[PDB]
Amino acid sequence: GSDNIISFDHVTFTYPDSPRPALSDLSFAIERGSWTALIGHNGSGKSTVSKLINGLLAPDDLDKSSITVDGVKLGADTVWEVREKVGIVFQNPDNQFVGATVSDDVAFGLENRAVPRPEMLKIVAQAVADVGMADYADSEPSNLSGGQKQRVAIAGILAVKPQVIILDESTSMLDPEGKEQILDLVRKIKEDNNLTVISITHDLEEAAGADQVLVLDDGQLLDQGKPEEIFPKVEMLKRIGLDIPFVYRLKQLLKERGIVLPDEIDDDEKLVQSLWQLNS
Amino acid sequence: IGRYLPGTTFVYRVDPRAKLLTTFYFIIMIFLANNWVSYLVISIFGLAYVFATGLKARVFWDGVKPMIWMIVFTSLLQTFFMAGGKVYWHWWIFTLSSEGLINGLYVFIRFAMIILVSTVMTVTTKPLEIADAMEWMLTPLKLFKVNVGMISLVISIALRFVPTLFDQTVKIMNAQRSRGADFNDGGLVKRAKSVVPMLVPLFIDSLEVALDLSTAMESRGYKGSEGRTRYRILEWSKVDLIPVAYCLLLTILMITTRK
Amino acid sequence: AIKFENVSYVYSPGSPLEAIGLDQLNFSLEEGKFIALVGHTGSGKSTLMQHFNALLKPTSGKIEIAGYTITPETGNKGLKDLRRKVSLAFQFSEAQLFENTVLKDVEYGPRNFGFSEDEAREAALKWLKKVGLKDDLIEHSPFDLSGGQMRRVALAGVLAYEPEIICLDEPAAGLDPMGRLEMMQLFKDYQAAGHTVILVTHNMDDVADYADDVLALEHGRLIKHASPKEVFKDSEWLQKHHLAEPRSARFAAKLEAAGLKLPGQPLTMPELADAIKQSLK
Amino acid sequence: SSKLELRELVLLAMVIAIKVILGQFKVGNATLQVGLGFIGSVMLGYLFGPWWGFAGGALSDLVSSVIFGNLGGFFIGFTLTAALGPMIYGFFLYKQPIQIWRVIASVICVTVICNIGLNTLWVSMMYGINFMVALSSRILKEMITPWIQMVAVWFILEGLSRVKLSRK
Numbered sequence: 010g011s012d013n014i015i016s017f018d019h020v021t022f023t024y025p026d027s028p029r030p031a032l033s034d035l036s037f038a039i040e041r042g043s044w045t046a047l048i049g050h051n052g053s054g055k056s057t058v059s060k061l062i063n064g065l066l067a068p069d070d071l072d073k074s075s076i077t078v079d080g081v082k083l084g085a086d087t088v089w090e091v092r093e094k095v096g097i098v099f100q101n102p103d104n105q106f107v108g109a110t111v112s113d114d115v116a117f118g119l120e121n122r123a124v125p126r127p128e129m130l131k132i133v134a135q136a137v138a139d140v141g142m143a144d145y146a147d148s149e150p151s152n153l154s155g156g157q158k159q160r161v162a163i164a165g166i167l168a169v170k171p172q173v174i175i176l177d178e179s180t181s182m183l184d185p186e187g188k189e190q191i192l193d194l195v196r197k198i199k200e201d202n203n204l205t206v207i208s209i210t211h212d213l214e215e216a217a218g219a220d221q222v223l224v225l226d227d228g229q230l231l232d233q234g235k236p237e238e239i240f241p242k243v244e245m246l247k248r249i250g251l252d253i254p255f256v257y258r259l260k261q262l263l264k265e266r267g268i269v270l271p272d273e274i275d276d277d278e279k280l281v282q283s284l285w286q287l288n289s
Numbered sequence: 290i291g292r293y294l295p296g297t298t299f300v301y302r303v304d305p306r307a308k309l310l311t312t313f314y315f316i317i318m319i320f321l322a323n324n325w326v327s328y329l330v331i332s333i334f335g336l337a338y339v340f341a342t343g344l345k346a347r348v349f350w351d352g353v354k355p356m357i358w359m360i361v362f363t364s365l366l367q368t369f370f371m372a373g374g375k376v377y378w379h380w381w382i383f384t385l386s387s388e389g390l391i392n393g394l395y396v397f398i399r400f401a402m403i404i405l406v407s408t409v410m411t412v413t414t415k416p417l418e419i420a421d422a423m424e425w426m427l428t429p430l431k432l433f434k435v436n437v438g439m440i441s442l443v444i445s446i447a448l449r450f451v452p453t454l455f456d457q458t459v460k461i462m463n464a465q466r467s468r469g470a471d472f473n474d475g476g477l478v479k480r481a482k483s484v485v486p487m488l489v490p491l492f493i494d495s496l497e498v499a500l501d502l503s504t505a506m507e508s509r510g511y512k513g514s515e516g517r518t519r520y521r522i523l524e525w526s527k528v529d530l531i532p533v534a535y536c537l538l539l540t541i542l543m544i545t546t547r548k
Numbered sequence: 549a550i551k552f553e554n555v556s557y558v559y560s561p562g563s564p565l566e567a568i569g570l571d572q573l574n575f576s577l578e579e580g581k582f583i584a585l586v587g588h589t590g591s592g593k594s595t596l597m598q599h600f601n602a603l604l605k606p607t608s609g610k611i612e613i614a615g616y617t618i619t620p621e622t623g624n625k626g627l628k629d630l631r632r633k634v635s636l637a638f639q640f641s642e643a644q645l646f647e648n649t650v651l652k653d654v655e656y657g658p659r660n661f662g663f664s665e666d667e668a669r670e671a672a673l674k675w676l677k678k679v680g681l682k683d684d685l686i687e688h689s690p691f692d693l694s695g696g697q698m699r700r701v702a703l704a705g706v707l708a709y710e711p712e713i714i715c716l717d718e719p720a721a722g723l724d725p726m727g728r729l730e731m732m733q734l735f736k737d738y739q740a741a742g743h744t745v746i747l748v749t750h751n752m753d754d755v756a757d758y759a760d761d762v763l764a765l766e767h768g769r770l771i772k773h774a775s776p777k778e779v780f781k782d783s784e785w786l787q788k789h790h791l792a793e794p795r796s797a798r799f800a801a802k803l804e805a806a807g808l809k810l811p812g813q814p815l816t817m818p819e820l821a822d823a824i825k826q827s828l829k
Numbered sequence: 830s831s832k833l834e835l836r837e838l839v840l841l842a843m844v845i846a847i848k849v850i851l852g853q854f855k856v857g858n859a860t861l862q863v864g865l866g867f868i869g870s871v872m873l874g875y876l877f878g879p880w881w882g883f884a885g886g887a888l889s890d891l892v893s894s895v896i897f898g899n900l901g902g903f904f905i906g907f908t909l910t911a912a913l914g915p916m917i918y919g920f921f922l923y924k925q926p927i928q929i930w931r932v933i934a935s936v937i938c939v940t941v942i943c944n945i946g947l948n949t950l951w952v953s954m955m956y957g958i959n960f961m962v963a964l965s966s967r968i969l970k971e972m973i974t975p976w977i978q979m980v981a982v983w984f985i986l987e988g989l990s991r992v993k994l995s996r997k
């Protein structure tokens with residue numbers, strides 16, 4: 010069914026300080042086995058969501074508050090058991106890295122769970138193998154590109170076999186080639202193990218390929234659901250603090266000079282074949 | 290920017306906690322004794338080990354170079370210990386003697402043999418191994434009042450973030466220089482007060498990684514030190530006997546000649 | 549008046565393991581035009597950045613910039629005045645800042661170049677508005693700010709003394725799209741204001757849409773120096789020396805391959821809109 | 830609990846890494862070098878207190894020892910002295926205000942008590958008197974440097990590092 014929901018609840022940091030830091034009532038949910046992006050301006054509260062789901066942070070009602078992830082209500086105890094169904098890949102690998110080799114870092118969580126080493130070895134090999142990091146497996150963090158550092162981050166969480174992979178702006182500053190691969194990595198990873206990928210990104214061109222997106226602004230969500238219906242929000246969406254993708258701006262910049270607009274229509278090959286049709 | 294390790298390609302340099310413990314044992318073997326022949330047996334053994342490695346001698350100079358002044362300063366000044374000593378004439382008190390200047394060759398060999406085994410350790414092995422070497426020296430004292438989980442953990446984190454703090458230091462250096470920061474230059478005050486723009490942004494960057502690392506740690510399931518397993522796992526293999534040979538063979542005869 | 553005369557660079561010289569940042573760079577750049585710098589990662593593009601403010605000096609050849617000339621010999625004597633002309637805001641400028649307030653931190657730059665207190669006070673606000681944030685927080689401490697504002701005041705502190713040549717590595721690398729087309733606007737507005745702009749970013753969307761010069765780099769070597777057209781047009785070329793087409797050039801090439809050939813030179817989206825009316829024409 | 834915890838502890842790991850790096854470099858002028866490792870020592874004092882301080886210096890010598898020389902070793906006891914410096918910085922500075930009486934009395938003692946006595950006691954490994962004279966030979970620095978150190982420490986500590994402690 011549905012994998013994760015956040016019911017009526019609110020949150021603050023650091024602890025309750027002055028003016029009103031928070032997300033909002035929220036009233037938000039996501040389906041099992043579906044890639045879902047979460048977008049908002051800088052300081053819209055996108056990080057908190059990931060740490061809330063994670064359990065590192067707690068909401069400020071606790072009566073009204075229900076965050077349940079695959080059948081656990083979060084809430085003080087049970088937090089390590091909800092922490093085993095979710096995993097998080099933070100942006101900027103350097104600070105998120107721990108351990109000597111890469112084969113050292115990706116078995117960290119594994120020894121957190123007191124897994125015997127003879128098994129630990131096998132898993133960790135397959136883990137780095139899965140992320141393509143195979144023969145860099147004795148190298149230390151400093152030698153690695155921040156891109157392939159974030160491959161080691163993946164193999165880190167891929168090792169403990171989570172049902173939800175959160176990407177928190179993991180792709181942020183990488184190569185174009187390097188940002189291409191990491192998503193195509195986790196996107197490969199997804200189909201294999203049948204997981205849920207919660208992406209967080211400022212890149213709107215890769216939000217178009219989400220199953221469901223949802224927008225968050227200043228405290229709260231405004232619109233949510235299938236990318237098809239969310240991106241057409243045009244003008245308001247611009248003032249909202251984020252922007253248009255390329256295909257949709259292509260739609261826009263076509264119409265600005267008058268040209269036809271059949272819409273949604275959100276793809277590449279579906280455009281390209283539609284392009285043959287419009288040429289007629 | 291690594292140091293030192295011309296450890297490339299030759300034989301040994303194996304089993305660090307064996308090797309480390311040896312150099313710790315050799316230190317205290319020198320410390321012990323004595324007037325004659327004891328100083329002979331440890332000095333020859335120390336020399337045996339350094340070319341057993343097959344190491345270029347030139348590297349040993351690197352460690353003694355700052356101390357050279359300190360050697361010959363204390364050595365000859367030990368001789369001229371105002372009487373003091375000892376056996377011969379030539380001449381005063383207050384002056385050289387055949388006994389006085391032998392003692393001054395002993396401080397030379399001890400200071401050498403300290404900075405030989407100290408060198409032979411700090412070069413032939415690798416830092417992450419040495420960290421697991423002196424984790425072993427800590428192993429016994431656990432059930433005394435010290436939690437070894439924590440003083441093992443902070444070392445591990447420290448080491449890893451030493452270079453990545455160094456590079457973010459020079460990034461701040463150059464980032465400030467580009468903005469017109471000039472240092473050192475100046476004199477006394479402001480030479481000085483010009484150091485803070487490289488410090489506090491280095492300090493606050495430490496918090497950013499402190500939070501991020503602790504955050505990313507807990508989320509991967511870090512409950513505490515108690516109740517884990519380990520990935521790394523050093524092993525003794527067959528060469529192990531060679532440092533125990535050095536250890537037990539030298540120092541039974543060194544102890545008999547001690548007195 | 550940027551000129552690089554057979555300029556290489558080698559790391560760790562007189563030492564074993566000398567890695568080469570730059571190999572025989574020869575090129576010259578227009579005064580007051582948007583000059584993009586791109587390559588794969590570990591190209592040596594950030595090395596090149598701190599070359600012409602002379603944080604590093606060439607190990608070969610000559611660099612004539614800002615009416616100075618930078619030899620392998622040139623010392624650390626007069627570089628002070630070289631840097632009021634040329635300026636760098638490194639990849640993360642948020643980590644560049646300090647003291648008790650925003651205002652005194654930006655003026656720190658001009659103050660170091662010998663601006664009067666009055667001059668530095670007015671020059672402070674002059675560029676703290678230009679970076680569009682904000683009336684009230686101008687007197688706030690720099691440390692409580694958001695990542696949007698933290699990488700502003702830094703970029704103000706670099707711009708406050710009005711560098712003639714400005715080179716910024718990945719200044720928008722962490723921002724949101726409201727930020728980019730905000731920050732990328734000021735770079736272009738400073739440009740037509742009569743100042744040179746070097747900008748180094750992987751982003752090929754704003755490299756085509758903004759930049760005039762692009763000079764690619766690979767393994768320390770200069771592979772191409774041109775308009776973002778000459779270099780961008782050859783498709784499989786960009787594969788060979790690892791680079792990538794912008795968003796427009798990617799989709800057009802595909803619709804073209806099976807489809808119609810428009811007259812572009814696609815670059816920015818407005819021109820793309822031009823190119824697809826001619827399709828029916 | 831024991832005292833501190835993760836995120837308190839990951840910080841302790843990042844501020845030792847400072848003082849192994851700091852103690853590597855010296856500034857310094859044509860007149861005198863006055864190497865700066867000491868800022869690392871004082872930080873561990875007033876933040877993490879006296880008793881974690883002692884645990885900081887002891888480890889900071891073990892940390893440097895792997896990536897650098899120790900100029901000898903191991904000793905053990907060099908580490909013992911590297912330890913005691915940050916500790917008595919902990920006193921006068923932890924759960925304590927910013928005051929001119931606390932800083933200078935602390936700087937002068939570090940040189941004389943631990944730096945002198947212990948450095949006067951470690952290359953000892955022999956009889957004591959040959960030792961004192963090698964250090965008696967070296968004293969000038971311990972006369973000059975502590976005084977520039979008190980000026981320097983006031984410019985770091987009250988000098989916006991402690992004022993920027995919070996927040997955060």
Ligand SMILES: Nc1ncnc2c1ncn2[C@@H]1O[C@H](COP(=O)(O)OP(=O)(O)NP(=O)(O)O)[C@@H](O)[C@H]1O
Nearest residue numbers: 022023050051052053054055056057100178694695
């Ligand atoms: N102590 C704190 N811990 C965490 N967040 C804090 C704290 N204090 C304030 N905040 C706010 O938390 C918000 C989280 O927003 P955030 O998700 O960081 O947006 P962002 O700029 O895109 N950075 P991020 O998404 O994490 O990569 C920010 O607006 C901060 O102002």
Ligand SMILES: Nc1ncnc2c1ncn2[C@@H]1O[C@H](COP(=O)(O)OP(=O)(O)NP(=O)(O)O)[C@@H](O)[C@H]1O
Nearest residue numbers: 559560567569588589590591592593594595639717
């Ligand atoms: N301190 C150093 N010593 C030796 N080689 C270095 C050093 N710093 C960098 N290099 C080398 O020089 C090149 C650095 O290129 P550089 O442009 O700085 O990185 P980049 O990722 O391509 N650009 P950027 O992302 O803006 O930092 C690489 O080939 C490095 O191996």
